[PDB]
Amino acid sequence: PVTLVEARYKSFSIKMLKDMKEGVKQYGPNSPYMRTLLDSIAHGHRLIPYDWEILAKSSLSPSQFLQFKTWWIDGVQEQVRRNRAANPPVNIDADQLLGIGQNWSTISQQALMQNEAIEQVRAICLRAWEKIQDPGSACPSFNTVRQGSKEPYPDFVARLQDVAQKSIADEKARKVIVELMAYENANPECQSAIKPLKGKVPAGSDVISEYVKACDGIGG
Amino acid sequence: PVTLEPVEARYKSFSIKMLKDMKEGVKQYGPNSPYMRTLLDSIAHGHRLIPYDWEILAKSSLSPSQFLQFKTWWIDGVQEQVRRNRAANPPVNIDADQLLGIGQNWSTISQQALMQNEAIEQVRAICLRAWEKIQDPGSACPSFNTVRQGSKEPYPDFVARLQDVAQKSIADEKARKVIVELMAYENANPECQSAIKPLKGKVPAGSDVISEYVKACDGIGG
Amino acid sequence: PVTLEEARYKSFSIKMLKDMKEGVKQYGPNSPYMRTLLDSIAHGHRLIPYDWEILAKSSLSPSQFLQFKTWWIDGVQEQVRRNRAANPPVNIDADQLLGIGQNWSTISQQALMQNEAIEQVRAICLRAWEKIQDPGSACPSFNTVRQGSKEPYPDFVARLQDVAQKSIADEKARKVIVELMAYENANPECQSAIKPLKGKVPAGSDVISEYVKACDGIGG
Amino acid sequence: PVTLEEARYKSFSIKMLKDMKEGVKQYGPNSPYMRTLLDSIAHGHRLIPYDWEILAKSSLSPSQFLQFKTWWIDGVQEQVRRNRAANPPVNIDADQLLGIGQNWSTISQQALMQNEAIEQVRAICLRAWEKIQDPGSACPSFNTVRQGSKEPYPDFVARLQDVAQKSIADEKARKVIVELMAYENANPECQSAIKPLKGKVPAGSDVISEYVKACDGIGG
């Protein structure tokens, strides 16, 4: 990252890259430990689009760098359409956020970027990292995730909370969908255990807290 | 590595932690994972490597079955490079046994610590192209006829295999592009073959063809 | 053609049209004999787009004048995207090449085209003629053409250079594919016979000329 | 060809090319009719190696121009090993015969070759034309061609002189093999009919003319 009297760009150490690879390989790219570590890296530095490529290339499988680059390209193609419709329109084109082109293809040209382009490339890079799949799997639809027999209830809810995180982009639309689907796809035991509790949050609680509290020793 | 303080050049062996990190990286992730490539480039470009140190680094990091392949492709690379040092004007004075580190003039560390940079860069390029050909610890290099996206397999896991095969076999990158962009459609399953076919041969703006190809048949897991 | 001794449109002779239909019907529209015959008419005359209408209609099957008109129309849609996007932009629109419209729909209007336009229509009709299929077949894919057992080797490579000419437009990209696929799709018997000769062209030779040398007696 | 009335390169006529393709397609590239027709063009003109490019491309199958270019290239690699190893050495390198390179890659450079070079290219293209296969077959071995039962005898010997012309280059070595194999690979019925006539040619005759005399009525 770059350090603010002029712009000086220094690569990462070996320890940071070793920790990132050892995290991604063992726990997954979207385990909560990796999200916490990645947000601590990104919010605590000044990342140019060179550094997202250096970080993601040296940490991900080659089957996952393709997905990272693809959803980065999709995110900047949608962010450009909201950038020209401004009043005044901002001078943030596609080739300034992708880190390629004629005027933006070397680290000396990129190190003189403003705060708004930094905070705009950060959100689309994080949303790109949020969509990277696990090595052997594909993202399923909501018709497939059902609590099978002999399976705990929070293990069932924590699959829905991830499926609704890869697909749907708005959090308010995530909450209503997972609150609805937590009752329809449940086992008959947890459905009968959860039916007298529906639509009743007592005080300062989440709905799914009382839901997982309700059916508790049911499966096993 | 070796270092130069000027009128003389001194030698020092590798660290005790560096070889440990290299062995853990090669054993757990692979010899040609993208992490080990940047680690090896950071070691090579930031130091001065004589072929003695290349043999020490490759001996203490690879399998007993992988040092054979590294030595074989090192020998083949020097055999192909010598034929471009005698067909030059002026003829470049780098024979076979200056690159391989053998012989009578080039068999000790004090004999090898006096090399010039036009041979250091050559042995660096040959050693890196040799390391790019070492296989995984149980497999042989397949041909392009066999890499096919089977049913119930995601799409980018197939393009990753195609790019690995094209990196191991073909030595020209401009030819590496135009073969994998064609084979990425002829070897897909019928569902991605139906999904790519509307968008075939059209780039919108400033992207790679695979970036729209993986975007097209995204959720093929039903 | 049109002759300038200042314009004079002369029709085709009865003997020239008799030899084109007799040649197309017996050898094919893309035999090497018809390729040199068609160039001696094109490069030796002044063909307006009204004359490619008469020459192709009176020489091709009714199922092949449909394919010749398709890839003619599709070829102008890419020529205008290299006509206006150049500096300076040239006045070559769509309906000047296709020979339709209001200003380009008679002999007396098309008889005064310039040599920038005559040379551009002549290079896209000849690219349309390279895609006209045989009278009963469709263009196969690259992974389908394999050397069958008890089939001679130069008959296999002759098929390989035909699939790689209807599909790929760049002649450099043909060169890297038809040499690569010549060993991989081959027979098991030649694959043990080409492999010692692989990738070592000695002096003043082609790659495949050294390959057909090695399977000189592979028929049983 | 080139005419000297001091150089003038004239292209081929439209009627000469029409008869070569009509002849090759119907009878074969190595019928006795095409052998005398090709010699009347070669021995009656001045063919530069640019003209063997046009004549063979506009007359052969695409699978047969690959074989014509292979044995042309292979034939120059043996001519240079009889060019420099003679006393005195002649200035006939590889890229003068093949018509490639920098000094031999246009019409105006090749129009001034000498009659030592014109006569040497003319004897190796004509040897390349003797090896071009039929449009669906490969060259069989000598122990495969046997006279089948209920097959006429001169049709068997006509096959024997065709295998012994693509394989063996020395015309004296053809003579001792096609006469020896004419009795050994023959039918049981002619083998009892040729054996009293064996090895006794009376006066002013060929060996096989006395052999086809003896199987005049062997068809059943």
Numbering used by the authors:
A (entry chain H): 1 to 4, 21 to 236
B (entry chain G): 1 to 6, 21 to 236
C (entry chain I), D (entry chain I): 1 to 5, 22 to 236
Cite, word for word, the article reporting this structure.
CA forms the capsid shell surrounding the viral core that protects and transports the viral genome and also interacts with host cell factors that are necessary for trafficking, nuclear entry and proviral integration. Further, we assemble particles from HML2 CArec in vitro and use single-particle cryogenic electron microscopy (cryo-EM) to determine the high-resolution structures of four different types of Fullerene shell assemblies. Analysis of the shell structures reveals the intra- and inter-molecular interactions that drives CA assembly into pentamers and hexamers and their association into shells that encapsidate the retroviral genome.
The D5 particle is an elongated or capsular expansion of the T = 1 particle with polar regions identical to T = 1, but containing five equatorially inserted distorted hexamers, consistent with local two-fold (dihedral) symmetry. Moreover, adaptation of hexamers to the local environment is also a feature of our other D5 and D6 capsular assemblies, where hexamers interact with each other in the equatorial belt. In the D5 and D6 particles, further configurations are possible depending on whether pentamers and hexamers are located at poles or are equatorial and interact either longitudinally or laterally.
